[PDB]
Amino acid sequence: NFLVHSSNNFGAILPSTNVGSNTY
Amino acid sequence: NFLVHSSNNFGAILPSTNVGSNTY
Amino acid sequence: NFLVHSSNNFGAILPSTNVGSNTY
Amino acid sequence: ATQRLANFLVHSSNNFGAILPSTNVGSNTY
Amino acid sequence: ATQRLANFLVHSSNNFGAILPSTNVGSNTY
Amino acid sequence: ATQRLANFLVHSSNNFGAILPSTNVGSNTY
Amino acid sequence: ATQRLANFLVHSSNNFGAILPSTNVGSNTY
Amino acid sequence: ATQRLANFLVHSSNNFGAILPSTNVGSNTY
Amino acid sequence: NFLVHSSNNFGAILPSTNVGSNTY
Amino acid sequence: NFLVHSSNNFGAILPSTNVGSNTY
């Protein structure tokens, strides 16, 4: 029934992430 | 029934994030 | 039934965020 | 520490390119 | 510490490019 | 510390590019 | 430390390119 | 440390290119 | 039924934010 | 019944991420 163009992406060319410490 | 252009992205060329510490 | 241009993005070229500490 | 989380509902009828990044607990950067 | 969270509803009828980043607890940067 | 949060409703009929970033508890920067 | 997490619902009726990266606990970058 | 996680539901009716990377605990980069 | 141009973005070229401490 | 173009990808040319330590 459904007629969809369904095109999705992500932009990440250089993630660089230093979370550290978490407590929950 | 539905006719959609459904194009979504993210912008992130250089994330650099230092969360630290969390308590919840 | 629905005819939508549905284009969404984010702007983040250099996030750099140091949360610290939270209590909830 | 500890946690107590319950009964989370994210219902949406229709979002025409509506940005609702309704993120619960966690550390992401994409 | 601790937490007690319940009964969260994000209902939307129609959002024509409405920005509702209704984010609950967590650390994100995108 | 602690928390007690309940019964949160974000209902919108129609938003023509209305900016309602109705964010509950959490640390974001986008 | 410890954790207590329950009753998480992410229901969506219809999302026309709606961005809802509703991520629970964890460390991702994509 | 320890963990206690239960009752996680990710139900979606229809997502027209909706991005819901609802990732629970773990370390991924893709 | 609905015919919308639905283009939305964010402006953030250099966030740098040091929350500190919160109690709720 | 359903007629969909269903094309999805990820953008990651150089992830480099140093998580550190987590407690849950």
DSSP I1-24: --EEE--B----S------B----
Three-state DSSP class for residue G25: coil
Please report the sign of the dihedral spanned by the C-alpha atoms of residue F17, residue F22, residue F26, residue G2: negative
Three-state DSSP class for residue F11: coil
- In chain C, positions 1-24, which contact chain F (CB-CB < 8 Å)? 10-12, 15, 17, 19, 22-24
Residues I6, D16: C-beta atoms closer than 8 Å: yes
| CB neighbours of residue H30 within 10 Å | 12
State both tokens at I6.
């639905």
State both tokens at C12.
């983040």
d(C-alpha G27, C-alpha B8), whole Å: 22
**Structure determination method:** cryo-EM
d(C-alpha E22, C-alpha G25), whole Å: 17
Residues D30, B15: C-beta atoms closer than 8 Å: yes
- Let me know: does H20 contact J8? Beta carbons within 8 Å: no
Q: Which residue of B has its CA nearest to G19?
A: B8
Q: Is E27 at the interface with chain B, CB within 8 A?
A: yes
Q: Give the chains touching G; criterion: ≥3 Cβ pairs < 8 Å.
A: A, B, C, D, E, H, J
- Let me know: does A5 contact B7? Beta carbons within 8 Å: yes
State both tokens at J6.
């269903």
d(C-alpha G5, C-alpha J24), whole Å: 11
Nearest to G18 by CA among B15, D25, E12: E12
d(C-alpha B14, C-alpha G20), whole Å: 22
What amino acid occupies position D2?
T
The closest CB to that of C20, out of I7, I9, I20, belongs to I20
d(C-alpha D16, C-alpha D10), whole Å: 16
Residues in G closer than 8 angstroms to E28, CB to CB, are 23
- Tokens 């989380």, residue? D5
Three-state DSSP class for residue G19: strand
d(C-alpha E19, C-alpha E11), whole Å: 14
Residues F27, C24: C-beta atoms closer than 8 Å: no
| CB neighbours of residue D1 within 10 Å | 18
- Let me know: does I3 contact C6? Beta carbons within 8 Å: no
